[PDB]
Amino acid sequence: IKVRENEPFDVALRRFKRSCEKAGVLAEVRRREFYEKPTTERKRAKASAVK
Amino acid sequence: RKQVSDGVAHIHASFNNTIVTITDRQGNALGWATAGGSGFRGSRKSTPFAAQVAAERCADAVKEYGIKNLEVMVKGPGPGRESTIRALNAAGFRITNITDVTPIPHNGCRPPKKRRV
Amino acid sequence: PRRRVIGQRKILPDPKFGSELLAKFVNILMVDGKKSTAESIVYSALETLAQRSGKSELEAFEVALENVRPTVEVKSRRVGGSTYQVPVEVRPVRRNALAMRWIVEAARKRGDKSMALRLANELSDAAENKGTAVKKREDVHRMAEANKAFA
RNA sequence: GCUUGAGUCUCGUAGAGGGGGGUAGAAUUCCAGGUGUAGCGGUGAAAUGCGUAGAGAUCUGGAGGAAUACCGGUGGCGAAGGCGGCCCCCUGGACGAAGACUGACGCUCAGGUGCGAAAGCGUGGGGAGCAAACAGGAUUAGAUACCCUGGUAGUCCACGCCGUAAACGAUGUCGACUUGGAGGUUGUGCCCUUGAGGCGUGGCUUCCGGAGCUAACGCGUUAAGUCGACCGCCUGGGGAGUACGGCCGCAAGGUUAAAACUCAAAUGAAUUGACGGGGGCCCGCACAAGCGGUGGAGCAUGUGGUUUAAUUCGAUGCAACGCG
Q1: Which of A14, B106, C72, C100 has the least CB density, counted as fewest CB within 10 Å?
Q2: Distance CA A41, CA A26 (A)
């Protein structure tokens, strides 16, 4: 979660949060408890991941 | 006044508004500025521009403390936050840490229903 | 413009000063295909402009037009189902094209006697940037300055 | 009698199988306090709402309830419903390896009995979040909706009831046989284990496909192929899974289950097109960028209407209206 750097620093370059929290994990927990849509969203996500 | 010389910039980016609170390392607030309190009410208070002018305006109003070092703590998602920390090192601050402190439940409370828009 | 990227046609420069800039200014002023009339108006008006300001001809014109050129202008998007007025940087040819259109339009708005006096007084009011075309430029810049939040 | 079906014993393996008890960490809400100050929240935009009685932000301390991120996987377990932190206790099943034992003890099953999501019901608790009802704000022609702000039952626990779901692989159970390929998961044997190998042999499971079948779509060794055993159910659409009666249920209702009348269709799958406020690519003064008009005035001319003895007939969205 943290970053620090010594005096050679210019830019933020914190892409630790395109790794874990920001993009998916908080936008997922904005909306409803189903049990049902996730079983089919994961079903078609794993059925789309195919050659 | 009171001459703290190090603080924390808690930026609270949400989808509708970013609210920047500059405090000390004890956690006592020294002065805040919101994107909605800088003109541009409404669809324009959730933009990176509004967040950066919110952060410029929060860098003002803590001149009475002589803050040079600060950590940055970032909550929430938002069109803000990224631009926000930029405005902080456009205001002479030595930005030391950038932590992202978004609250994530370990499957806690049930989130609200919504949005069949 | 759907498909066709275009060239542009070359205008003959001004027959008194060799200025294609001022040639496009007499084309912006021209009505009903009467070019002789419009260049008479431009020569009279800029001649009294050069006599009044005492500078010279087309540097008095170039100053009076430099005060009315827009910096950035608003522009509609309609991308996310919403009406945004985004600010966008004006191209130089469009920059002085808008400058001349605002000078000429504001000069047609004025209430003096002859067109050479309306436009000579409009360029003179734009030399110390207090006329109507500068209020059009400040108006455009208030729109693009208020809506700066979209880039 | 016999062991190739079924079962017992020995040793292990994997597992969100079940029931009871405890605990942990993040987060939401509330309460008390510090800093601090003008907004916060919300939306397509807003407003209701909260806020100078000091909100929101931020830090500290506390309480409480529910759910258990990451692992997490067309992964696993379960007859099905379903089961997801970690630990203990009680407990069910499955699978594998070698050997021993019983010796057809088997398969299916009408009535019967049990289990059976969610919502609901009863009694007693609990109540943080979420949220039917409800209230307010918007949107709209209206808006008893979608959106916003609140919000009660309920969701959670104990015991009892209900007894249903698109309770679905829309595929009853058990057994046998019939070309293949790529995986996943869990055992086990053999070989230099010369490593994240090589060769087999089981259990469960995913995707694609051969013959075959199928109205087609598709199924395809986990069959919808080729057979056998037993059960359940169907007989045109509507009326109607309704009424009456019976049984069950506290009720809601559940189950069993018609007829009169009425139609000549209702239906399945696939084809061609058209359409979509579906998707991709592309064009045209289509939009955009501009310039000049029309709609306002007077007149010209055409039309509708009205008038008239007649105001000849035809043209009438675009593509009729100085048109024939």
Answers
A1: B106
A2: 17
Q: And the tokens for C78?
A: 């309609």
Sketch the domain layout of chain B as residue ranges: 2-117
List Cβ neighbours of B58 (8 Å cut-off, separation of 6 or more).
B9, B20, B21, B22, B31, B32, B33
d(CA B108, CA B112): 13
A12/B105 CB distance under 8 A: no
- Please, are residues C23 and C39 in contact by the beta-carbon 8 Å criterion? no
DSSP lists the bridge partners of residue B18 as B13
Q: Which nucleotide is nearest to A47 (CA to C1')?
A: D74
Alpha carbon B39 to its chain centroid, in Å, reads 17
Q: Are residues C58 and C128 in contact, defined by beta-carbon separation less than 8 angstroms? A: no
- The gap from C-alpha B23 to its chain's centroid, in whole angstroms, comes to 11
Please give the order of strands across the beta sheet that includes B6-13.
Answer: B29-34, B18-24, B6-13, B69-75, B94-100
Give resolution, Å, one decimal.
2.9
Domain range list for chain A:
1-51
